[PDB]
A paper describes a structure:
14-3-3 proteins interact with many phosphorylated proteins, with differing affinities and cellular concentrations. Drugging the hub protein 14-3-3 raises the challenge of selectivity, given that 14-3-3 binds several hundred phosphoprotein partners. Inspired by chemical crosslinking and reversible covalent fragment-based drug discovery, we developed an approach that we term “molecular locks” to rapidly access molecular glue-like tool compounds. These dual-covalent small molecules reversibly react with a nucleophilic amino acid on each of the partner proteins to dynamically crosslink the protein complex.
Lock 10 also showed weak stabilization of RND3 (SF100 ∼ 7.9). An interesting binding profile was observed for 14-3-3γ/RND3 modulation by fragments 1, 5, and 10. At short time lengths, all compounds showed immediate destabilization of the complex, as illustrated by the higher KDapp values in the presence of 1, 5, or 10 relative to the binary complex (DMSO). These results indicate rapid disulfide exchange between the fragments and RND3, leading to reduced RND3 binding to 14-3-3. Over time, molecular lock 10 and to a lesser extent 5 showed an enhancement in RND3 binding to 14-3-3γ, whereas disulfide fragment 1 remains an inhibitor. This provides an indication of the order of complex assembly for molecular locks 5 and 10, suggesting that disulfide formation positions the lock in proximity to Lys122 of 14-3-3 for imine bond formation, causing the observed inhibitor-to-stabilizer behavior. Analysis of lock 10 with the 14-3-3/RND3 complex showed clear electron density for the disulfide bond, but only partial imine bond formation was observed with the noncovalent free aldehyde being the major species. We reasoned that 10 adopted an unfavorable conformation for crosslinking, potentially a function of the steric clash between +3 Val of RND3 and 10 that destabilized the interactions. In ERRγ, a less sterically bulky +3 Ala is present. The lack of covalent crosslinking for lock 10 provides explanation for the differences in stabilization when comparing ERRγ and RND3.
Author numbering:
A (entry chain A), B (entry chain A): -4 to 231
C (entry chain B), D (entry chain B): 237 to 241, 303 to 304
Write the structure that this text describes.
Amino acid sequence: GAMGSMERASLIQKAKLAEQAERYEDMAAFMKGAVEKGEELSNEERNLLSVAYKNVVGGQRAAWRVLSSIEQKSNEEGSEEKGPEVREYREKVETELQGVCDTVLGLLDSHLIKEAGDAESRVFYLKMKGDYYRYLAEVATGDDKKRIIDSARSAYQEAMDISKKEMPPTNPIRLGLALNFSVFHYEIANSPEEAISLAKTTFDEAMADLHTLSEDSYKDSTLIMQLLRDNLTLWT
Amino acid sequence: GAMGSMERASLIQKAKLAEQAERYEDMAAFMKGAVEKGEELSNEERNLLSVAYKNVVGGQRAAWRVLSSIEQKSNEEGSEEKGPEVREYREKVETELQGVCDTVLGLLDSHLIKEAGDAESRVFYLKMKGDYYRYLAEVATGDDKKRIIDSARSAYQEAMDISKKEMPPTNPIRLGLALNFSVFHYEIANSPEEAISLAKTTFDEAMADLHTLSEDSYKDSTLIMQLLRDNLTLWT
Amino acid sequence: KAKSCTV
Amino acid sequence: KAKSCTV
Ligand SMILES: CN(CCS)C(=O)c1cc(Br)cc(C=O)c1
Ligand SMILES: CN(CCS)C(=O)c1cc(Br)cc(C=O)c1
Ligand SMILES: [Cl-]
Ligand SMILES: [Cl-]
Ligand SMILES: [Mg+2]
Ligand SMILES: [Mg+2]
Ligand SMILES: [Mg+2]
Ligand SMILES: [Mg+2]
Ligand SMILES: [Mg+2]
């Protein structure tokens, strides 16, 4: 690893600087190096890991969607033949995106998940595992598509089971997990009714528990509840 | 510290590479960075520290002696005035040499010596403290000269007291300490008889203990005994 | 595109 | 110059 010679604390420090400079590829490489030191991650460090890779893969997904739309238009009736370039370049972006997803999944498997015993860390990592399988599923078209979708589903389901037992309904990790699993149901699993039911039940159970929270926790929880509400408005 | 971001193990690895490449300034900087990590040093790491700085200061001392000899000749009767350049350049080299000695002494004081409890480490560091005060004494000409000489003497004497109680007379650290303390007596303290007596007693006590050693230990000890013999031949 | 957990 | 502990 190219980060093997850098101190863990220096990698963390540089990940924070990279975030401030909006250098998310660097941020992700620093956080990968920090994970590979072999120690468990703190709450703040887990957030840095997730932010870094979400920004990297988010740019790749946006580019893939632009190219996929151009390619789909090229395959309409009446569209001129322009050669293999659109497919080739969409495939290039797709392969890079898959590589980033495989990198994140590899960090989770070696060995973040197995070492995560507290609910807050274990749910966080299992949510990430579901997310990166979901991003693989967004671009999958072959014979492994069903297994990729089931891998996302299985990780989300394990995270949900733990989150319901071990964390209050307003916990931001629990809420973000439920948000992303609902998106999985709607966008990946062809299950819009399950997506709607999960978003509604999650929102309502969080609403009923807001009275227990401080002002700052209330702000954290209601921010994610608004995302659930936004999706419910889009979907209904 | 410019090495603060590098892993301790990487600094050690690079010190060994620098030794192989005869890059002793780099070697010393890597080992300084390793000491500043705050952990105690192993036997091998102590040897790397000493080799690195001995080579750096050895080059400075050789250069200082060349320049000091030129300067002394400039102050002979009949020598032409050539301006301040020889003194200025001798002073430049001298200041750099003093800086390296102060750096080593600072590492020993913060905090190698205080953390060294085993005889092999404590004697090694106290010998080094005597050596670097001795190198300061070689160039000292002012009102602190006597105190610099006494600082070297005091460190050597503490190392000798521990070495005689805790280590066999053939131990290479004990032998190298006695060798260097004898050189201190001869070259710094104007005590050639003490130098001769120490070298002879050290040699004879080691000779009587060689029968206890393996072939490899015998080779290690007799190598240093030959240095004591070489000095005795020079001095008598 | 539905909103997922970001920013 | 006397030999000290080096090399
Ligand atoms: C506001 N917000 C992001 C929108 S859900 C979060 O609290 C958050 C951040 C990160 Br990193 C991970 C998770 C996981 O659930 C949740
Ligand atoms: C052969 N040899 C060098 C000539 S004394 C040594 O065993 C040696 C090496 C180092 Br580093 C430190 C010491 C300290 O006593 C001794
Ligand atoms: Cl291409
Ligand atoms: Cl100069
Ligand atoms: Mg470290
Ligand atoms: Mg653990
Ligand atoms: Mg709990
Ligand atoms: Mg100790
Ligand atoms: Mg002993």
